[PDB]
Design an enzyme around this catalytic site. Structure first.
Site, short mmCIF file in Angstrom:
data_model
loop_
_atom_site.label_atom_id
_atom_site.label_comp_id
_atom_site.label_asym_id
_atom_site.label_seq_id
_atom_site.Cartn_x
_atom_site.Cartn_y
_atom_site.Cartn_z
N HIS A 36 20.81 -8.36 -5.86
CA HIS A 36 20.87 -7.32 -4.85
C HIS A 36 22.32 -7.11 -4.46
O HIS A 36 23.13 -8.04 -4.52
CB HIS A 36 20.06 -7.65 -3.61
N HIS A 46 16.40 -5.78 -14.01
CA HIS A 46 15.79 -7.09 -14.15
C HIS A 46 16.07 -7.65 -15.53
O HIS A 46 16.04 -6.92 -16.53
CB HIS A 46 14.27 -7.02 -13.97
N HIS A 103 15.47 1.05 -8.87
CA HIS A 103 16.13 0.52 -7.68
C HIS A 103 17.01 -0.68 -7.99
O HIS A 103 17.77 -1.10 -7.11
CB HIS A 103 15.10 0.13 -6.62
N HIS A 116 10.93 -6.99 -1.42
CA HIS A 116 10.61 -5.58 -1.45
C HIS A 116 9.15 -5.45 -1.86
O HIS A 116 8.52 -6.45 -2.23
CB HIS A 116 11.55 -4.79 -2.37
N1 LIG Z 1 13.67 -9.91 -4.45
S1 LIG Z 1 12.54 -11.09 -4.86
O1 LIG Z 1 11.77 -11.48 -3.48
O2 LIG Z 1 13.19 -12.36 -5.64
C1 LIG Z 1 11.26 -10.41 -5.93
C2 LIG Z 1 10.72 -9.17 -5.63
C3 LIG Z 1 9.72 -8.67 -6.44
C4 LIG Z 1 9.28 -9.40 -7.54
N2 LIG Z 1 8.24 -8.84 -8.39
C5 LIG Z 1 6.93 -9.47 -8.55
O3 LIG Z 1 6.64 -10.46 -7.97
N3 LIG Z 1 5.96 -8.84 -9.42
C6 LIG Z 1 4.65 -9.43 -9.60
C7 LIG Z 1 3.64 -8.29 -9.58
N4 LIG Z 1 2.51 -8.59 -10.45
C8 LIG Z 1 1.62 -7.44 -10.46
C9 LIG Z 1 0.57 -7.66 -9.39
C10 LIG Z 1 0.46 -8.91 -8.80
C11 LIG Z 1 -0.48 -9.15 -7.82
C12 LIG Z 1 -1.33 -8.12 -7.43
F1 LIG Z 1 -2.26 -8.35 -6.46
C13 LIG Z 1 -1.22 -6.86 -8.02
C14 LIG Z 1 -0.27 -6.63 -9.00
C15 LIG Z 1 9.82 -10.63 -7.83
C16 LIG Z 1 10.82 -11.15 -7.02
ZN LIG Z 2 15.37 -10.16 -5.25
#
Ligand SMILES: NS(=O)(=O)c1ccc(NC(=O)NCCNCc2ccc(F)cc2)cc1
Ligand SMILES: [Zn+2]
Length: 257
Positions: free
Chosen positions: A93, A64, A61, A197
C-alpha cells in the site's frame, strides 16, 4: 464497486460492507506505551520456496504477486501461531505523497508505504476461499516502509510493473522468495484484525514488524505510475490505496520484544 476515491472510498465502505464498523478492523495505530509484552510469543519463522512464485496482476486499486499454494513449500510458523500458515500473496500500500502511505501507524507516525505478506491456515482449512472468512484463517505480516535510500530488494518487483500497467493485465512472476523483503530483525507486534479493504473480513492475525525497510521516492513513484483504468481508456494513476487507522475497540496489541 469500492475504491479509494472520495465517493467509493474507506469512509463510505460501510454502506456495502457493514463490518467496516466492526470491533476487529484493520489497520490500527500501535501505541507502544499500551502494548503488552508476551513471553509466550515465539519467534516468527518464515520458510518460502522461490519456485512457488506464480503471477503478478494489476487489480485496479493495487497490484498483487501471487504464489502457488497447493502444498507447504512456503510457510509461516511461530509467533502467536500453533498452526502452519501457507503463503499465497504479497502486495503493497502507498499514499498520494511520501508523508503518508502506510496503513498501520506507530505512535501516530505514518510511513511512506507498507508491505503485506499474506498466508492462510492450511492446518485447519482446505483452501484460501474457505480460510478467508474464519477468525483464525489468515496471517499477514506488515512491514512499514520508510522513505530514504533505494531498496535493491524491490528490483524484480519494480521491473515487472511495465508488463501490467493497466487494470486486469497479468504476467508470470517466478523464482522469487519474498522473505528477502523482510527486515533483518523480526521483532513484532501482533493483534487480531481484518482485511484492510473489502470484503474486510475479521479473519487476520496481524504481525507488524518493529523494524522498517527502506524505499526511495522514485520507487514509490513507480507504484503511483501504475494505472487503474483498462487499456485504451483515459489513464488514471493509482495515487493511493491505504486505509485510515481504525478504533482498537478494546483489543490488545502484544509485543514480542
Ligand atoms: N491488505 S490485506 O488486509 O493484507 C488483504 C486484503 C485483501 C485480501 N484478499 C483476500 O483475502 N481474498 C480472499 C477472497 N476469497 C474469495 C471469497 C472468500 C470468502 C467468501 F465468503 C467469499 C469469497 C488479502 C489481504
Ligand atoms: Zn494489504
Amino acid at each position: 464497486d469500492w475504491g479509494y476515491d472520495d465517493k467509493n472510498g474507506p469512509e463510505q465502505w460501510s454502506k456495502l460492507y457493514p463490518i467496516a464498523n466492526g470491533n476487529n478492523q484493520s489497520p490500527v495505530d500501535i501505541k507502544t506505551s499500551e502494548t503488552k509484552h508476551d513471553t509466550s510469543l515465539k519467534p516468527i519463522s518464515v520458510s518460502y520456496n522461490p519456485a512457488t512464485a506464480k503471477e503478478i496482476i494489476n487489480v485496479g486499486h493495487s497490484f498483487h504477486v501471487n504464489f502457488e499454494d497447493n502444498d507447504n513449500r512456503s510457510v509461516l510458523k511461530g509467533g502467536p501461531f500453533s498452526d502452519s500458515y501457507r503463503l499465497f500473496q504479497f502486495h503493497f500500500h502507498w499514499g498520494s505523497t511520501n508523508e503518508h502511505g502506510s496503513e498501520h501507524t506507530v505512535d501516530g507516525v505514518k510511513y511512506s508505504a507498507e508491505l503485506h505478506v499474506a498466508h492462510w491456515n492450511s492446518a485447519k482449512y482446505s483452501s484460501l476461499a474457505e480460510a478467508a472468512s474464519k477468525a483464525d484463517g489468515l496471517a499477514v505480516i506488515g512491514v512499514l516502509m520508510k522513505v530514504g535510500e533505494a531498496n535493491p530488494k524491490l528490483q524484480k518487483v519494480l521491473d515487472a510493473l511495465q508488463a501490467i500497467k493497466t487494470k486486469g493485465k497479468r504476467a508470470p512472476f517466478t523464482n522469487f522468495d519474498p522473505s528477502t523483503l523482510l527486515p533483518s530483525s523480526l521483532d513484532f507486534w501482533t493483534y487480531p484484525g481484518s482485511l484492510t479493504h473489502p470484503p474486510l473480513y475479521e479473519s487476520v492475525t496481524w504481525i507488524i514488524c518493529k523494524e522498517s525497510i527502506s524505499v526511495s521516492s522514485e520507487q514509490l513513484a513507480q507504484f503511483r505510475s501504475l494505472l487503474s483504468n483498462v487499456e485504451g481508456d483515459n489513464a488514471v494513476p493509482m495515487q493511493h490505496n491505504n486505509r485510515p487507522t481504525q478504533p482498537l475497540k478494546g483489543r490488545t496489541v502484544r509485543a514480542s520484544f
